[PDB]
Amino acid sequence: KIHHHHHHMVSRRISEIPISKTMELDAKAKALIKKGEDVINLTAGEPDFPTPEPVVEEAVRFLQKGEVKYTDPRGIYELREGIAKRIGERYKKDISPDQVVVTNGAKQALFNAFMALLDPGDEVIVFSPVWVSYIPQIILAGGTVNVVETFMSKNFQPSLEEVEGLLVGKTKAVLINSPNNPTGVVYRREFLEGLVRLAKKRNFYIISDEVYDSLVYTDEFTSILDVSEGFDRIVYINGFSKSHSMTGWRVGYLISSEKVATAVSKIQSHTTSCINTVAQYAALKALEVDNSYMVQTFKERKNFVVERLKKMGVKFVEPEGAFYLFFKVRGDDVKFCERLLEEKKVALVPGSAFLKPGFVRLSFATSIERLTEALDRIEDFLNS
Amino acid sequence: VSRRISEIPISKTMELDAKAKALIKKGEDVINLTAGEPDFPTPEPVVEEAVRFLQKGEVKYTDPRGIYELREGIAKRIGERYKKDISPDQVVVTNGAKQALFNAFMALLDPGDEVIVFSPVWVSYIPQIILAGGTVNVVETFMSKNFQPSLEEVEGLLVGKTKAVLINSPNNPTGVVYRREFLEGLVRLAKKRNFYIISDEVYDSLVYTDEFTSILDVSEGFDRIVYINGFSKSHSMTGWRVGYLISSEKVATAVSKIQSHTTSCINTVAQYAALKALEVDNSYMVQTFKERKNFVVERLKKMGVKFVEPEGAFYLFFKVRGDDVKFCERLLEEKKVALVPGSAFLKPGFVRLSFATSIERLTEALDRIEDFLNS
């Protein structure tokens, strides 16, 4: 007899996606929990608030009619119009509903942008410390990435000067995320105005991920929509996940030119089609809902963690938004987090995950009570 | 704007959709037989479970592959139906079967790889394959052969960069089911020449015959098989956007990566809804569709219309003389009945009628179609 053997190959691009530095640490935290350990988990990327009750009530009312059917792939007109009107009023712009595409979280708005704008080999400039999903998405879309590192000594502010220096012919977009995950910084108005100038001159799109724009602890937040006129070179990304603690609903959106929105809408349509109809109605109600209580709760947690860490001699840039604090650790950050987890049962995220080694990310989407206990344990750990 | 978006074939149906709405605005009584979704509500036990989940207020991120209990439920039902041992880690929950398909192409195709598809072909497959960087090779099937593909023709298109053959049975737009002997032959060819069979079985519940065979009836294991299904058609849950992919653990892991970085996890409410939907019987809806199928076949057959009797799904794909886009445009304008041109599925000279409507409305639409054909 004669034996033959077959390979079972997946696409090379899957390999090209960076490995998780984080999947083992989450499994470690969960395993400590399952054997009766008191793990304080400060790694969350989502608010610890429920969906606002008015949103629940509207979703239930819609649901009880029993009709959950396909919609326009770009989102129901009323949701697009509501989004267009809210963002338009906030930033004194005339946004048409046809400039908006409703997507499965801001995450799919981002992916759709890259797929809509990037030809194979096109380059996107990103700024580290950088959120974990951007690079995977750009890779999946056929693009390449130029990571521009920022520094704690510069308050993690990108250098406009240095950005122009890196522009090449293939540079199709510059991605900004303010307020920033994982640092919590908010980009300066002067930088953004300049970037908008660079985009007109040097012919590239600005993709702006502003999902944390409500969770601001300061009056210095500047949106790309504060410094732009029109959307010719702007892709604006937001959604309901952070602002309304609706992460599991998966509702976000993109606003750009009608041209880009149309392209993005084609991606949306052929990939997932329309998003969950219940979610669309939930989001439409969410537009009417005030999140002031949540934002103030996060502001006071931010103030508490900031004061506490300063006192312990820990080094960091004071976050002005989102719900992260990115602080400096001695040695290897992965090992820092492994040991703190195993010894103190506090879970943090290695800065390595965000391409900035020697740092750790703490989330303060938990009670002051739990934060106090965690910060206690961290202080003990820092003084062996 | 990326080149691939321009590579996407232009819609044949955009003007027609807009004309149907315009006619409605003008108070015209349009009978719209274009639907790709059942006309049933979400089953009430499903609604009740979704409501029960919702009222606790916690709608948060889950495992990007889908909650374990959902993956476990799906693995168990499919495994029990087809006498297979399926692990929950073989399953990825996705935003409809549509996203499972996209994720499969993204997970499997490198730039330039080929995928073979059969026309008449559902409108989203080719856009997806192009977005994923692939090229399409279309094998045409014929009414006189009950739209059953030639295995010889498939084989004659194979290259080293052929990564997949895509099958859709029961079929949209024809309603045919692929015979077992073809599927067995395909599985042999997939081993001989090293490609994946991607099987879109979303209509497998809506079958009016004993002759439906799944790719899982003819394959052993999942090393070359990508199985796609969901709740949209079986449970009339289209707007929930819940589907899934089952494959090898290696494929499912790659697909999980794509899901994770693109949309992440699906709507949490939808996941609990789908979990409950696994326990729900859809027999009443299937029997309703069967009776509608028998009625439309009988009526079209009597009026001398040529078509193959659908064996599944809720479409009938019949012959027309001339330009099928113009047929549909004129039928809509003159008789206020909406059909989809066969051209949209790469099969000119046909039109697609959907029977996701009541017999009363089907009766009236058919009267109008009979008049139109008899001038």
Ligand SMILES: *Cc1c(COP(=O)(O)O)cnc(C)c1O
């Ligand atoms: C949470 C988050 C998002 C959006 O997530 P969705 O839940 O998909 O809306 C986008 N960017 C950053 C940096 C985030 O942290």
Ligand SMILES: *Cc1c(COP(=O)(O)O)cnc(C)c1O
């Ligand atoms: C409706 C349909 C699907 C599934 O759509 P989802 O709503 O995304 O699950 C898949 N394939 C065909 C051929 C269809 O008609």
